Design an enzyme around this catalytic site. Structure first.
Site, PDB file in Angstrom:
ATOM      1  CB  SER A 132      -0.977  -0.118   1.202  1.00 19.06           C
ATOM      2  OG  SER A 132      -2.104   0.778   0.919  1.00 19.06           O
ATOM      3  CG  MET A 133       0.101   5.203   1.606  1.00 13.20           C
ATOM      4  SD  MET A 133      -0.598   6.384   2.743  1.00 13.20           S
ATOM      5  CE  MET A 133      -2.038   6.967   1.669  1.00 13.20           C
ATOM      6  CD1 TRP A 156      -3.239   4.869  -2.620  1.00 12.02           C
ATOM      7  CD2 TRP A 156      -1.618   6.249  -2.236  1.00 12.02           C
ATOM      8  NE1 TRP A 156      -3.589   6.088  -2.846  1.00 12.02           N
ATOM      9  CE2 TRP A 156      -2.777   6.853  -2.633  1.00 12.02           C
ATOM     10  CE3 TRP A 156      -0.297   6.972  -1.621  1.00 12.02           C
ATOM     11  CZ2 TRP A 156      -2.996   8.294  -2.029  1.00 12.02           C
ATOM     12  CZ3 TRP A 156      -0.366   8.310  -1.499  1.00 12.02           C
ATOM     13  CH2 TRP A 156      -1.755   9.083  -1.747  1.00 12.02           C
ATOM     14  CG  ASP A 176      -6.008  -2.135  -4.941  1.00 10.55           C
ATOM     15  OD1 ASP A 176      -6.838  -1.467  -4.019  1.00 10.55           O
ATOM     16  OD2 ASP A 176      -4.495  -2.391  -4.423  1.00 10.55           O
ATOM     17  CG  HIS A 208      -5.373  -2.067  -1.104  1.00 10.81           C
ATOM     18  ND1 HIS A 208      -4.434  -1.721  -2.127  1.00 10.81           N
ATOM     19  CD2 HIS A 208      -5.067  -1.617   0.294  1.00 10.81           C
ATOM     20  CE1 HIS A 208      -3.493  -0.931  -1.378  1.00 10.81           C
ATOM     21  NE2 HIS A 208      -3.886  -0.568  -0.193  1.00 10.81           N
TER      22      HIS A 208
END
Length: 265
Positions: A132-133, A156, A176, A208
């Site tokens: 993710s981040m 992300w 996602d 996700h």
């Protein structure tokens, strides 16, 4: 070949729940670390030094995490530190700082006289896996020139990744909603330079969470992810056969594949 560990691999061997080594853990508290605390996973009954990997989650509303990767990779002859969910970091720039702090900690453990992984880490062979981040963070760190392999999971971010310097395998999650592939994973892959070895594996109908491990996608994650770290942290060309050669999109779980095989020596 000098860094090769374990038996000659097969698909069945990669897809098996565990690799050839039993695994032990050592907890790292947030009180004594600067990256949020975590778990160091390491194989028993090995000698010499091995590559080390940091695995980082970075989804703001995560309900579970990426710890499947810890025992999975450690069982194949890696020292692997999974980072706990940590609200003290958030956006990708901060996740890159978090990753670097974790790598620093794990490097320092190699010479810590109380660490169970004292003397087990080749501090010159480091990899990062991040969700993710934290996948944005992984791509940022992969641009800095220290790490030798990067696996962003459902990344992300808001920047561009033309300067990535480590061999990079992106796991993308087709469905996602959090980091839509058309805005995140896919353009990030397409920005990667042509002078690195790279791959893009989109998992069919994935949310996700599709690459976090521990559910129905373990075969694809194992074959690609273990092979990536073997090939690029251990220079173990016995694993090239799983990355380069197969018709990847014939796998019902892989809705899209991209890469620049072969990965020459």
């Amino acid at each position: 070949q000098s860094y090769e560990r374990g038996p000659d691999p097969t698909v069945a061997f990669l897809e098996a729940s565990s690799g050839p080594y039993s695994v032990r853990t050592s907890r790292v508290s947030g009180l004594v670390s600067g990256f949020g605390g975590g778990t160091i996973h390491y194989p028993t009954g090995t000698t010499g030094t091995m590559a080390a990997i940091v695995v980082i989650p970075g989804f703001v509303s995560a309900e579970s995490s990426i710890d499947w990767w810890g025992p999975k990779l450690a069982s194949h002859g890696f020292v692997v530190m999974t980072i706990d969910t940590n609200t003290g970091f958030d956006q990708p720039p901060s996740r890159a700082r978090q990753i670097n702090n974790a790598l620093d900690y794990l490097v320092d453990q190699n010479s810590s006289r109380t660490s169970p992984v004292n003397g087990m880490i080749d501090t010159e062979r480091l990899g990062v896996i991040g969700w993710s981040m934290g996948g944005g963070g992984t791509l940022r760190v992969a641009s800095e020139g220290r790490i030798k392999a990067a696996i962003p999971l459902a990344p992300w971010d808001t920047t561009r990744f033309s300067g990535v310097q480590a061999p990079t395998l992106i796991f993308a999650c087709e469905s996602d909603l959090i980091a839509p592939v058309r805005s995140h994973a896919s353009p990030f892959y397409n920005q990667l330079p042509n002078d690195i070895d790279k791959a893009y594996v989109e998992i069919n109908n994935g949310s996700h969470y599709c690459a976090n491990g521990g559910g129905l996608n373990n075969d694809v994650l194992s074959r690609f992810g273990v092979s990536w770290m073997k090939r690029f942290l251990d220079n173990d060309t016995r694993y090239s056969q799983f990355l380069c050669g197969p018709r990847h999109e014939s796998d019902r779980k892989i809705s899209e594949y991209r890469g620049n095989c072969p990965y020459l020596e």
